[PDB]
Design a protein around this nucleic acid. Sequence first.
DNA 1: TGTGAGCGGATAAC
DNA 2: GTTATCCGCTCACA
Lengths: 329, 329
Amino acid sequence: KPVTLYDVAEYAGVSYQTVSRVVNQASHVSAKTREKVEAAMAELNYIPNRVAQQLAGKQSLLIGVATSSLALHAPSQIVAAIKSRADQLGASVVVSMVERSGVEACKTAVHNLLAQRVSGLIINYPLDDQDAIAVEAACTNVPALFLDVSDQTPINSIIFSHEDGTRLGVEHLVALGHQQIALLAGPLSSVSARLRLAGWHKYLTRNQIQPIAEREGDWSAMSGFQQTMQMLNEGIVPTAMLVANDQMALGAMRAITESGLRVGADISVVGYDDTEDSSCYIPPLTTIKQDFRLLGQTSVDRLLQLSQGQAVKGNQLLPVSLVKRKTTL
Amino acid sequence: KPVTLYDVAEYAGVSYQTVSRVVNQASHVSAKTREKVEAAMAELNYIPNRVAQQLAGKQSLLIGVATSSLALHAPSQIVAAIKSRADQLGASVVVSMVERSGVEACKTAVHNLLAQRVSGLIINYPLDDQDAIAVEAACTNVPALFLDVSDQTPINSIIFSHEDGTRLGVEHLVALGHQQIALLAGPLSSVSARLRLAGWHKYLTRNQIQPIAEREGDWSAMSGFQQTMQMLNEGIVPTAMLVANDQMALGAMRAITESGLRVGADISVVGYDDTEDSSCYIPPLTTIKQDFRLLGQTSVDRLLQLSQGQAVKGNQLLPVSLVKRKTTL
DNA sequence: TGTGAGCGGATAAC
DNA sequence: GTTATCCGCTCACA
Ligand SMILES: C[C@H]1O[C@@H](Oc2ccccc2[N+](=O)[O-])[C@H](O)[C@@H](O)[C@H]1O
Ligand SMILES: C[C@H]1O[C@@H](Oc2ccccc2[N+](=O)[O-])[C@H](O)[C@@H](O)[C@H]1O
């Protein structure tokens, strides 16, 4: 097993404290003694057992992250931006991936993250209000920030403004003069899917419009395809569709096209996310931009502020925007 | 400061060892004593400080993973399947994301993973032969498995058979009677991009064919677009293209279409990966299937075998396959 | 099951 | 520049 601080004590002729001094950039070192000790640990390959450094009391800021499967677009992008920004702040990051659906699984996750004595948690998992409050509670003393909860949940949270996103989409379609609109929402088991569904209903109502169709996908392009197919086979043919995310928009666009209709000219389409690929869809997809980098970056900055008892409690809203491409004509 | 094993000692009337026994599914427990101790830790909220469990000597097959940015499709899918399979085997997994390009960065990564005293490493980062060997060396005593190296590198490794993939693609295009083929390879800084480029050249040669064009993308759909555009603007117009991955194939398809040509009928196309989205591209993309789940699953199984001094040293090849869609006509 | 000593280190006084 | 000694636990012993 690994080179101890004790192994460098004898291979340098000093004590475990002498080496400790040198390693910690010590105050008062035997001058040439530090030159010999550093050479001793260099020839040997000393990598400080952080497991022991932490238990011994070394105050290191370590961010824990419970997130939905990384197999999903947005989650990954976010974990990415998190780690990124973390490294940039000299902060470490351990992440626990929750696959099983349920609050229990998400608790299990928070449990292990807690065990690793993280200094704060970031929960990017769909949680219902009370469930979110329960998780919040289990975070024994440590701050927790939520990324997949509703703006109404009484906890700390950062989320993109579904209010602005759904409006932007509805007002765009209406300004184009659309009235026969259909809705393809994400899975209802996802808080964010629901918020967006609501958003649409809300503003569709303010313009005295009623969706002539409303289907549920599962974030996947295939679903977007199947649902838009069944819809078109039931004779319901809108002139514009609002889809819960770019990928399902893709599947939607497929079905629309393989059905002899022209995305844009016959049935306009609008996505959500503005993923990298969306800009090269056939034709280019008009969508709602959600700056995952910003979310991830902001999430870390904030979790650190909270860890420092800074007064920034509550829910925060990140801006979004409309990206006009070629699917809305 | 969390509930200790000591806090459950007094709130149950026993010692730190009594609770330890109960927690570890003990051999000889005071019968009704265990019933009282379990009730004591249940009302309290005991979460074993894994930081101390490890330092104390608890052998936990803790798998470390150095990987390319999770923002990239395949990496994420893989980390996913890894954690998945890990949990399923009761194995823990810490991952260090390498963003900066370079061997140094990948070493830094292996360094921190080592510090956390992982029992084995999985390196999913593009490494040149010697670099790979150097990293292999820095893994002080612990086993390392590589996923982004060449089959010729003298280290443990698992990779999909680029030999089979490129052949499948070339023989498919030829059987369709294509002769004017162009090549769009991934970034040359990526081992796997190169292997596939080679693969193509290799089998294109055995059929006495010379690419009438060869361009380099960066994995992104945009690149696939730009490159296929410039190519089409230089008057070079093939009848089939072999692309390093589905996403660039998408960009390629875009450019082909916006150029008045019919993907399939005018310029056939073939991708690599068979990502989820590929099946709903306009039209559906013909590609080379790489079962990321299998890779990730296999990777963990193998890293454990090696950790147990099992004789499975060397390089392993994972099968791939051709998925005929509508882009090759 | 009650007891006692080492893990890899860090402070905080000695 | 030591030096005693606790961090939070796991066993090996008794
Ligand atoms: C940026 C937002 O996007 C959502 O992302 C989702 C979630 C899963 C798969 C795709 C998407 N998506 O948007 O296409 C998140 O669930 C939400 O919590 C927040 O990250
Ligand atoms: C299955 C393989 O595919 C490669 O994945 C890559 C990497 C980034 C973006 C696209 C692809 N690709 O294949 O199209 C990896 O380099 C290699 O490590 C392994 O993950």
